[PDB]
Structure formats: structure tokens, C-alpha cells
Design a protein around this motif. Structure first.
Motif, PDB file in Angstrom:
ATOM      1  N   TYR A  54       0.857  -1.187   0.000  1.00 28.41           N
ATOM      2  CA  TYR A  54       0.000   0.000   0.000  1.00 28.41           C
ATOM      3  C   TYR A  54       0.883   1.224   0.000  1.00 28.41           C
ATOM      4  N   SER A  55       0.279   2.397  -0.125  1.00 32.25           N
ATOM      5  CA  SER A  55       1.071   3.616  -0.166  1.00 32.25           C
ATOM      6  C   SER A  55       0.391   4.685   0.651  1.00 32.25           C
ATOM      7  N   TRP A  56       1.134   5.735   0.974  1.00 32.62           N
ATOM      8  CA  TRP A  56       0.526   6.847   1.660  1.00 32.62           C
ATOM      9  C   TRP A  56       1.026   8.195   1.163  1.00 32.62           C
ATOM     10  N   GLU A  57       0.167   9.198   1.318  1.00 27.73           N
ATOM     11  CA  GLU A  57       0.473  10.570   0.945  1.00 27.73           C
ATOM     12  C   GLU A  57       0.162  11.368   2.188  1.00 27.73           C
ATOM     13  N   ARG A  58       0.879  12.464   2.403  1.00 28.88           N
ATOM     14  CA  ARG A  58       0.810  13.142   3.687  1.00 28.88           C
ATOM     15  C   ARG A  58       1.229  14.603   3.631  1.00 28.88           C
ATOM     16  N   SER A  59       0.419  15.463   4.235  1.00 25.35           N
ATOM     17  CA  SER A  59       0.795  16.853   4.379  1.00 25.35           C
ATOM     18  C   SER A  59       0.940  17.159   5.853  1.00 25.35           C
ATOM     19  N   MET A  60       1.901  18.024   6.162  1.00 25.83           N
ATOM     20  CA  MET A  60       2.214  18.404   7.527  1.00 25.83           C
ATOM     21  C   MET A  60       2.395  19.920   7.602  1.00 25.83           C
ATOM     22  N   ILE A  61       1.465  20.575   8.278  1.00 26.46           N
ATOM     23  CA  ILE A  61       1.436  22.026   8.358  1.00 26.46           C
ATOM     24  C   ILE A  61       1.825  22.511   9.758  1.00 26.46           C
ATOM     25  N   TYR A  62       3.035  23.062   9.855  1.00 28.83           N
ATOM     26  CA  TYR A  62       3.554  23.603  11.115  1.00 28.83           C
ATOM     27  C   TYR A  62       2.997  24.998  11.354  1.00 28.83           C
ATOM     28  N   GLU A  63       2.833  25.340  12.630  1.00 28.73           N
ATOM     29  CA  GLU A  63       2.114  26.550  13.034  1.00 28.73           C
ATOM     30  C   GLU A  63       2.772  27.850  12.604  1.00 28.73           C
ATOM     31  N   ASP A  64       4.064  27.804  12.308  1.00 26.86           N
ATOM     32  CA  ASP A  64       4.762  28.998  11.839  1.00 26.86           C
ATOM     33  C   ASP A  64       4.896  29.049  10.306  1.00 26.86           C
ATOM     34  N   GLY A  65       4.092  28.249   9.609  1.00 25.32           N
ATOM     35  CA  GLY A  65       3.981  28.353   8.163  1.00 25.32           C
ATOM     36  C   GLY A  65       4.833  27.385   7.358  1.00 25.32           C
ATOM     37  N   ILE A 119       5.164   1.368  -0.149  1.00 28.81           N
ATOM     38  CA  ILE A 119       5.573   0.210   0.626  1.00 28.81           C
ATOM     39  C   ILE A 119       5.293  -1.112  -0.077  1.00 28.81           C
ATOM     40  N   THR A 120       6.374  -1.820  -0.407  1.00 28.33           N
ATOM     41  CA  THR A 120       6.319  -3.160  -0.981  1.00 28.33           C
ATOM     42  C   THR A 120       6.884  -4.201   0.012  1.00 28.33           C
ATOM     43  N   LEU A 121       6.758  -5.472  -0.324  1.00 29.47           N
ATOM     44  CA  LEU A 121       7.258  -6.511   0.564  1.00 29.47           C
ATOM     45  C   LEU A 121       8.085  -7.522  -0.224  1.00 29.47           C
ATOM     46  N   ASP A 122       9.320  -7.773   0.208  1.00 28.92           N
ATOM     47  CA  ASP A 122      10.124  -8.864  -0.363  1.00 28.92           C
ATOM     48  C   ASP A 122      10.499  -9.852   0.739  1.00 28.92           C
ATOM     49  N   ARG A 167     -13.251   8.039   3.674  1.00 35.26           N
ATOM     50  CA  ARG A 167     -13.855   9.051   2.807  1.00 35.26           C
ATOM     51  C   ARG A 167     -13.752   8.552   1.357  1.00 35.26           C
ATOM     52  N   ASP A 168     -14.864   8.608   0.628  1.00 29.54           N
ATOM     53  CA  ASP A 168     -14.881   8.208  -0.778  1.00 29.54           C
ATOM     54  C   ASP A 168     -14.143   6.902  -1.063  1.00 29.54           C
ATOM     55  N   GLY A 169     -14.265   5.926  -0.168  1.00 28.93           N
ATOM     56  CA  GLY A 169     -13.703   4.602  -0.397  1.00 28.93           C
ATOM     57  C   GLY A 169     -12.246   4.429  -0.026  1.00 28.93           C
ATOM     58  N   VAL A 170     -11.657   5.470   0.541  1.00 31.88           N
ATOM     59  CA  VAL A 170     -10.255   5.435   0.915  1.00 31.88           C
ATOM     60  C   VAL A 170     -10.053   5.816   2.387  1.00 31.88           C
ATOM     61  N   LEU A 171      -9.046   5.210   3.010  1.00 32.11           N
ATOM     62  CA  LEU A 171      -8.698   5.521   4.396  1.00 32.11           C
ATOM     63  C   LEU A 171      -7.848   6.800   4.567  1.00 32.11           C
ATOM     64  N   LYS A 172      -8.308   7.714   5.417  1.00 27.74           N
ATOM     65  CA  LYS A 172      -7.579   8.951   5.721  1.00 27.74           C
ATOM     66  C   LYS A 172      -7.333   9.064   7.228  1.00 27.74           C
ATOM     67  N   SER A 173      -6.400   9.930   7.629  1.00 25.94           N
ATOM     68  CA  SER A 173      -6.238  10.260   9.047  1.00 25.94           C
ATOM     69  C   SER A 173      -5.848  11.723   9.329  1.00 25.94           C
ATOM     70  N   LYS A 203      -2.085  15.314   7.901  1.00 21.81           N
ATOM     71  CA  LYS A 203      -3.154  14.752   7.068  1.00 21.81           C
ATOM     72  C   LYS A 203      -2.580  13.690   6.149  1.00 21.81           C
ATOM     73  N   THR A 204      -3.056  12.464   6.314  1.00 26.10           N
ATOM     74  CA  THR A 204      -2.520  11.351   5.559  1.00 26.10           C
ATOM     75  C   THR A 204      -3.606  10.617   4.775  1.00 26.10           C
ATOM     76  N   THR A 205      -3.284  10.237   3.535  1.00 25.74           N
ATOM     77  CA  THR A 205      -4.133   9.346   2.751  1.00 25.74           C
ATOM     78  C   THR A 205      -3.453   7.986   2.589  1.00 25.74           C
ATOM     79  N   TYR A 206      -4.165   6.914   2.920  1.00 23.92           N
ATOM     80  CA  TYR A 206      -3.658   5.553   2.732  1.00 23.92           C
ATOM     81  C   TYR A 206      -4.394   4.811   1.607  1.00 23.92           C
ATOM     82  N   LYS A 207      -3.639   4.150   0.736  1.00 22.83           N
ATOM     83  CA  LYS A 207      -4.211   3.416  -0.395  1.00 22.83           C
ATOM     84  C   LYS A 207      -3.613   2.021  -0.558  1.00 22.83           C
ATOM     85  N   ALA A 208      -4.408   0.991  -0.296  1.00 18.96           N
ATOM     86  CA  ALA A 208      -3.967  -0.375  -0.579  1.00 18.96           C
ATOM     87  C   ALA A 208      -3.789  -0.531  -2.087  1.00 18.96           C
ATOM     88  N   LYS A 209      -2.898  -1.429  -2.493  1.00 22.37           N
ATOM     89  CA  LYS A 209      -2.665  -1.685  -3.909  1.00 22.37           C
ATOM     90  C   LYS A 209      -3.823  -2.495  -4.497  1.00 22.37           C
TER      91      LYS A 209
END
Length: 213
Positions: free
Chosen positions: A83-94, A103-106, A145-151, A170-176
Motif C-alpha cells: 500500500y502507499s501513503w500521501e501526507r501533508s504536515m502544516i507547522y504553526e509557523d507556516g 511500501i512493498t514486501l520482499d 472518505r470516498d472509499g479510501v482511508l484517511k487520518s 493529514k494522511t491518505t492511505y491506499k492499498a494496492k
């Protein structure tokens, strides 16, 4: 059937902060069902890092979280494909960071391919002045949300000489492949730099996490 109580990790991160590029490789191991992990990280390019290592540590896998039986585990279910994830991180000083992890597995080893990008960290701020001590205990809130896991998380770094420096995650998680989706729930996180050399070229990093509702 592709998970063991003891799993290995290897990773590479490529990134930039305020336009200056760097790269880090890591090797670790953890216990997926215990929600515990640890790794050693090495700065390979762009060192010694001119910014707080702490903004990176959460980029360095929710597979390593203890899920009770009555909560759906979106992460352990997504392998072998991954699966994969996308993520934004907003610090209080801008200061704003983005990151992605694929993420893969071998065999017994999770493999990360990570991209990290931060911009607008003020020269006089705690990040560029390396005044961060540690992340306080985090509570991640997960929903669908809309079929996908967020946090969402309202995280906080303790600062040198007291007080805290806040960051909104803010993170979006997506299974392959298609995976059963969980109901709304929480994950508690403890993350810690257990040891590092002076200029953080080498870092030993730990996390422990447990789901609840």
C-alpha cells in the motif's frame, strides 16, 4: 501468510528542505503484532542536515501497530501487494512538508521508497535552528472518505527551554488491491530518537503504536 511476528525493514528517502536536497537510507526491524519497531538511519547526501531531524521521523508504516481483533486492520490486510501513503504536515509557523511512501514486501522485508519535501521554514524558527526536543505522544484519528482511508493528527514537538511547536498531519492511505475498510478509530503513537551522533548522520529510531476505539 506473508507476515511473521518478526519482520525486517529497509528504506530510502529522497527529499529537500527549503530547496536543499538530501537522502537517507535505513535498515530496521519490528514486531507487527506488538506494534513495535526500530531502525538505524544514515544520511547519505546533503549532510550534515541543517534542520531538525524530528520533522523526518514520522516519515520513517502502520503495519507496525497493534490492532485489537474488533477493529479492521487495513494495513496487515494489504499485503503481499502492499500500500502507499500521501501526507501533508502544516507547522504553526507556516513551514509545510509533504511526503509519500510506497511500501512493498520482499520475503520478510518491508521496503520503503520515500519522498519528503518541506518549504517555508523561517531561518529563525525552531526547525532551522534545531531547537526541537521530542514529539509528545500522538493520537491519530482514522476515518473513511470516498472509499479510501484517511487520518488526522494534531501533533506537538517539545522545544528547548520549554513550550511546544504544533503541526497538523493529514494522511491518505491506499492499498494496492481492494481491502476491507475499517470504521472510525484511533491509533496512539510513541516515537523516540533513542540515540544519534552529534550531527545526526546516524540515528537509532523507535516507535510503538496501538489501535483503539
Amino acid at each position: 501468510s506473508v507476515i511473521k511476528p518478526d519482520m525486517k525493514i529497509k528504506l530510502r528517502m529522497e527529499g529537500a528542505v527549503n530547496g536543499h536536497p538530501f537522502a537517507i537510507e535505513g535498515v530496521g526491524l519490528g514486531k507487527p503484532f506488538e506494534g513495535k519497531q526500530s531502525m538505524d538511519l544514515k544520511v547519505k547526501e546533503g549532510g550534515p542536515l541543517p534542520f531538525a531531524y524530528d520533522i523526518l521521523t514520522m516519515a520513517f508504516n502502520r503495519v507496525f501497530a497493534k490492532y485489537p481483533e474488533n477493529i479492521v486492520d487495513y494495513f496487515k490486510q494489504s499485503f503481499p501487494e502492499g500500500y502507499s501513503w500521501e501526507r501533508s504536515m502544516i507547522y504553526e509557523d507556516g513551514g509545510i512538508c509533504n511526503a509519500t511512501n510506497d511500501i512493498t514486501l520482499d520475503g520478510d522485508c518491508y521496503i520503503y521508497e520515500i519522498r519528503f519535501d518541506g518549504v517555508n521554514f523561517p531561518a529563525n524558527g525552531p526547525v532551522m535552528q534545531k531547537r526541537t526536543v521530542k514529539w509528545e505522544l500522538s493520537t491519530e484519528k482514522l476515518y473513511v472518505r470516498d472509499g479510501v482511508l484517511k487520518s488526522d493528527g494534531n501533533y506537538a514537538l517539545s522545544l528547548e527551554g520549554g513550550g511546544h511547536y504544533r503541526c497538523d498531519f493529514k494522511t491518505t492511505y491506499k492499498a494496492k488491491k481492494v481491502v476491507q475498510l475499517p470504521d472510525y478509530h484511533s491509533v496512539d503513537h510513541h516515537i523516540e530518537i533513542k540515540s544519534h551522533d552529534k550531527d545526526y548522520s546516524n540515528v537509532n529510531l523507535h516507535e510503538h503504536a496501538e489501535a483503539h476505539s
